[PDB]
Amino acid sequence: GYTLWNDQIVKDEEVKIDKEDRGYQFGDGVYEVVKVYNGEMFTVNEHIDRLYASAEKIRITIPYTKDKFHQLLHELVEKNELNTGHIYFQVTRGTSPRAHQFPENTVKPVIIGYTKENPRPLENLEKGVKATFVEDIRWLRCDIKSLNLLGAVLAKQEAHEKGCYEAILHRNNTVTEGSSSNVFGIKDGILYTHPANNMILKGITRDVVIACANEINMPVKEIPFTTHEALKMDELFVTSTTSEITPVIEIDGKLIRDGKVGEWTRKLQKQFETKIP
Amino acid sequence: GYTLWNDQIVKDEEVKIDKEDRGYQFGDGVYEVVKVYNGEMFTVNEHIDRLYASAEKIRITIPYTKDKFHQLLHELVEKNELNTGHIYFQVTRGTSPRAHQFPENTVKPVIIGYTKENPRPLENLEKGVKATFVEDIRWLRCDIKSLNLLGAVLAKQEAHEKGCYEAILHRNNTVTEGSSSNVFGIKDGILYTHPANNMILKGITRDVVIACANEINMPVKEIPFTTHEALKMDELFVTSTTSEITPVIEIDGKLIRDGKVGEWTRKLQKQFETKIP
Ligand SMILES: Cc1ncc(COP(=O)(O)O)c(C=O)c1O
Ligand SMILES: Cc1ncc(COP(=O)(O)O)c(C=O)c1O
């Protein structure tokens, strides 16, 4: 297919990464994932704003305007003829002779983007999934969506080995987020989720869902809950651009209530469907 | 020059990294740096053991024996005719379609190694350097020498901006290590340094310096000290493969004792000089 490589869309075969690309040596870069439904990009400007905010937090200056980036992404979906699936794209600080401090010569960032045809997870949204708790050993700036993803790679592998779809992370028993999702709990019609500070990533699906909840007039409290309280909830689900609102029906052998998708989760999925192209 | 690419030494321009190399998308790999003095690799068996141990802690299986690995490093130094400088080499989990969990299939690890000419930092050892305190925000598995180095590049940039050579990190008021070195304080003829647990990397120069202290009968206490205690030390210095024993004579505008390199730091540097090729 075709890959975005800085500001060109080339055949896949044509892109080559340097060994001293700082993204390969220090994970020094940021990224995003955008879902495409029937050829249209969902919340693409929101994701581009978060890419440039992640980049500013670690002082990378992306060399293109945000509107040029949106057009390049539109081009990439066309050439690859993507119908339903996603676009992955990342930015690294550039390739420079290995050193920890920023390149003294101003080097240009390297941008890579490509598509994958991938249907909606309908069986999971319908039936729900199993999850497991994992201690959060990640760094303290989880608000940046960076390529330093080793804490999340090891947590998701632990989950996959226990036959679970996702790992719910926690710092001394306060649930923060999932290895690649935000985590919500429902108790007595109220929506709970961890506040967006440096302990979590402020997910765009998370904020779409908090908006959907204000639209069905469901109260939202952004206060953290524990692993113990998570197990006492009436309903639980995880959110991300690729898993949408995926019900969690069981954690570590314990059923969440009766092991069935709850009523408020079905109400939030129906409201989320009105936002899809 | 020539680069080691998996088990072949090829010309630098032949090496191609893939955009779905897990080292590029997740920082999912481990690395080592080995100093070479006058064509001779210093403590190369200790660095290879620490590479295989870092790879095991995150379950990457290196496909070669330590002995084939040692031969490959040796060929690399002579193909490049390196006199004094260093070898850098890293291993990643491999190229696989992007997903956080390990390849369910079986993928081979990608190995990269290359050299850089670089003389000893003699002015620093003689004169000493300035340092700054920076809070440690890194993940909790700092005992693994992994490619997730973004907390360290940000600390090192901050130090460089203040005109300092190194950032001394501290977590809960306690000095842990530098962004790319270990830290030692001397008071009343006793050597102090933080214990090697998950908060620091157990540096190979750290262990060579502790051996120097044993040989000249200087007491070593592997006990944590606070930043205020650090400022009250009679002497201070930092260690790493490329900076050896660099005296620290000032931190954030406050002199360590008289601001001159101390007596015991000098007799530790004399002892280190007898270990060197
Ligand atoms: C660590 C982390 N938290 C939360 C999320 C959810 O973000 P989004 O809804 O923007 O995809 C993700 C993205 O997958 C993530 O990687
Ligand atoms: C974080 C950190 N601590 C300590 C060290 C010093 O270790 P060594 O003596 O093995 O080079 C390093 C070396 O790169 C390092 O990156």
Side-chain angles (χ1 to χ4, degrees), chain A residues 17 20-21 24-26 59 98 100-102 114 137 139-140 147-150 156-157 160-161, chain B residues 17 20-21 24-26 59 88 101-102 104 114 137 139-140 147-150 153 157 161:
Chain A
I17 284 85
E20 280 181 308
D21 189 320
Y24 196 49
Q25 296 196 139
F26 308 94
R59 299 216 249 150
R98 187 180 184 280
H100 286 64
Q101 77 287 337
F102 297 177
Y114 60 99
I137 62 164
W139 75 323
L140 301 188
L147 301 178
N148 277 208
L149 291 172
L150 197 38
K156 205 217 189 174
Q157 181 60 196
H160 186 84
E161 278 163 356
Chain B
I17 304 312
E20 283 187 305
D21 189 316
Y24 201 48
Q25 304 195 132
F26 300 101
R59 295 153 67 194
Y88 167 90
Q101 94 287 294
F102 305 169
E104 205 183 285
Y114 61 95
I137 55 163
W139 76 327
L140 301 183
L147 295 179
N148 280 213
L149 296 165
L150 188 51
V153 331
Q157 185 58 197
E161 268 162 15

Side-chain angles (χ1 to χ4, degrees), chain A residues 164-177:
Chain A
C164 301
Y165 177 83
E166 178 63 303
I168 294 168
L169 315 178
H170 63 96
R171 308 209 84 135
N172 299 139
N173 298 96
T174 294
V175 173
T176 45
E177 61 187 334

Side-chain angles (χ1 to χ4, degrees), chain A residues 98 100, chain B residues 31-33 47 50 138 142 145 149 152 177-182 200-206 239-242:
Chain A
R98 187 180 184 280
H100 286 64
Chain B
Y31 77 102
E32 280 295 334
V33 171
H47 280 282
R50 191 175 57 185
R138 304 172 299 162
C142 289
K145 199 172 169 63
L149 296 165
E177 57 179 345
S179 61
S180 68
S181 66
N182 287 300
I200 68 163
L201 180 74
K202 190 171 189 287
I204 289 169
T205 315
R206 175 190 187 279
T239 63
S240 83
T241 293
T242 56

Side-chain angles (χ1 to χ4, degrees), chain A residues 3 12 15-29 31 33 57-59 88 90 92-93 97-98 100-104 110-114 116 136-141 144 146-154 156-158 160-161 171 179-180, chain B residues 3 12-13 15-29 31 33 57-59 88 90 92-93 97-104 110 112-114 136-141 144 146-154 156-158 160-161 171 179-180:
Chain A
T3 297
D12 291 345
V15 54
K16 302 179 294 178
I17 284 85
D18 201 82
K19 64 187 155 61
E20 280 181 308
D21 189 320
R22 291 195 143 223
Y24 196 49
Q25 296 196 139
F26 308 94
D28 191 1
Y31 75 103
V33 177
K57 282 171 177 180
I58 59 176
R59 299 216 249 150
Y88 172 85
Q90 63 170 249
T92 69
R93 196 174 308 267
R98 187 180 184 280
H100 286 64
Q101 77 287 337
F102 297 177
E104 293 191 292
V110 178
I111 292 120
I112 289 290
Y114 60 99
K116 177 181 291 180
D136 196 334
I137 62 164
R138 297 178 303 160
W139 75 323
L140 301 188
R141 288 302 305 284
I144 303 170
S146 70
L147 301 178
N148 277 208
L149 291 172
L150 197 38
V153 165
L154 302 172
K156 205 217 189 174
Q157 181 60 196
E158 185 169 325
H160 186 84
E161 278 163 356
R171 308 209 84 135
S179 72
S180 53
Chain B
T3 295
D12 288 350
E13 66 270 9
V15 184
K16 292 188 292 180
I17 304 312
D18 198 85
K19 69 172 150 66
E20 283 187 305
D21 189 316
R22 294 176 60 99
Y24 201 48
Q25 304 195 132
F26 300 101
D28 187 8
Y31 77 102
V33 171
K57 282 170 168 183
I58 59 166
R59 295 153 67 194
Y88 167 90
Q90 62 172 68
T92 70
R93 198 176 307 270
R98 190 180 182 271
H100 290 65
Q101 94 287 294
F102 305 169
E104 205 183 285
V110 180
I112 293 287
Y114 61 95
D136 190 344
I137 55 163
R138 304 172 299 162
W139 76 327
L140 301 183
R141 280 287 250 140
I144 303 175
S146 76
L147 295 179
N148 280 213
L149 296 165
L150 188 51
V153 331
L154 297 186
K156 181 79 97 225
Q157 185 58 197
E158 182 178 335
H160 178 279
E161 268 162 15
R171 199 168 207 162
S179 61
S180 68

